[PDB]
Write a protein that binds this ligand. Sequence first.
Ligand SMILES: NC(=O)[C@H]1CCCN(C(=O)C2(c3ccoc3)CCC2)C1
Ligand SMILES: [Zn+2]
Length: 140
Amino acid sequence: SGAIYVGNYRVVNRHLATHNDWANLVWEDSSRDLLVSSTTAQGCDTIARCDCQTGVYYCSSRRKHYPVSFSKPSLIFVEASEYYPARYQSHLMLAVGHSEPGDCGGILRCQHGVVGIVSTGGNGLVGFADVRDLLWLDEE
Ligand SMILES: NC(=O)[C@H]1CCCN(C(=O)C2(c3ccoc3)CCC2)C1
Ligand SMILES: [Zn+2]
């Protein structure tokens, strides 16, 4: 579990969004596993605006932050799960690391701020849904 809190926005994994998130919806994209809902109070996370490919992520199943190298956001095939059929997930970045059911939502950060959140796992890999292209998160 986990979310990004920037301005009056809450960014979560679309497959983990609560009934309250859907009742206060701003934007969602199934192909990216992302959902953004509105908030009353202002958040303090800063979104990275960069092309960094090294950062640190939080892994809840190990209670540990890991430094990782990660690939550029791409269209990657993700196996069928209880949340989605087998499909290409877009804006996804992979790293060699630990990720198991329960780790989605963990923040990936670089020197510039928040890069994205854990969205995939298994096979000794971790996938992160990129949020650096969502420039609108910084305004309105
Ligand atoms: N974005 C998606 O389509 C994911 C939805 C949740 C499940 N997904 C995973 O990759 C798995 C996982 C491992 C660790 O966290 C999650 C489930 C076994 C691998 C796929
Ligand atoms: Zn960066």
